[PDB]
Amino acid sequence: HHHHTDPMVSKGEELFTGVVPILVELDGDVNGHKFSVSGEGEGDATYGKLTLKFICTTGKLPVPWPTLVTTLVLCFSRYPDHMKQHDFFKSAMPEGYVQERTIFFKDDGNYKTRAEVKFEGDTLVNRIELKGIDFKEDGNILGHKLEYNYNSHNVYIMADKQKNGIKSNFKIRHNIEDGSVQLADHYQQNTPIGDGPVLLPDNHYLSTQSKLSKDPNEKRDHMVLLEFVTAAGITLG
């Protein structure tokens, strides 16, 4: 199914051959409201395709589900063949990487997140802690004014040579029920859990596309996610 002249690329592609099961577990605290989310599903890195069901395990979710989408596995991005030498995410597996973000909601609070992404047996696991502070009690977030939908985005990736990983920033657009949008500026860094070597990329970006839905038989608070992610920004011609 795969054939790449670089054995570091081959290693990454071999782990993400076929369909891989995905487990997600998050503990969060926003403005004093603690909550937990479990997620299960599958990724097909060949098509940069994810499908996941998330359940709030503490009851009702105290923030809008779309605010957690970026928090709740870029190792499933589809990198075009001519760009596979730039895929940090697969090259850090199976030991994994740490993903850390600060998400600034313009004119509102911020999310601080830390995640370990790694294999446990055959399963790709994403375990996350989230701290949210300085949110307005009647703002778009705690007021629950975001529409249940999602826009397409560009995630810019640059090497971080001294941390042996990558840094990233990007702006997320959350549609609001009145017509406006709520902006969420993401700062992000990923560093490998292992000590071995990784692929440090040239500058490039990921094109993301996401669709939100509901399991009509599900009475718990939940979100179903379909997500496509493709690396781009480097030319072959």
UniProtKB/Swiss-Prot annotation:
<dbReference type="Pfam" id="PF01353">
    <property type="entry name" value="GFP"/>
</dbReference>
<protein>
    <recommendedName>
        <fullName>Green fluorescent protein</fullName>
    </recommendedName>
</protein>
<dbReference type="GO" id="GO:0008218">
    <property type="term" value="P:bioluminescence"/>
</dbReference>
<keyword id="KW-0455">Luminescence</keyword>
<dbReference type="InterPro" id="IPR011584">
    <property type="entry name" value="GFP-related"/>
</dbReference>
<keyword id="KW-0599">Photoprotein</keyword>
<keyword id="KW-0157">Chromophore</keyword>
<comment type="similarity">
    <text>Belongs to the GFP family.</text>
</comment>
<dbReference type="InterPro" id="IPR000786">
    <property type="entry name" value="Green_fluorescent_prot"/>
</dbReference>
<dbReference type="GO" id="GO:0006091">
    <property type="term" value="P:generation of precursor metabolites and energy"/>
</dbReference>
<dbReference type="InterPro" id="IPR009017">
    <property type="entry name" value="GFP"/>
</dbReference>
<comment type="subunit">
    <text>Monomer.</text>
</comment>
<comment type="function">
    <text>Energy-transfer acceptor. Its role is to transduce the blue chemiluminescence of the protein aequorin into green fluorescent light by energy transfer. Fluoresces in vivo upon receiving energy from the Ca(2+)-activated photoprotein aequorin.</text>
</comment>
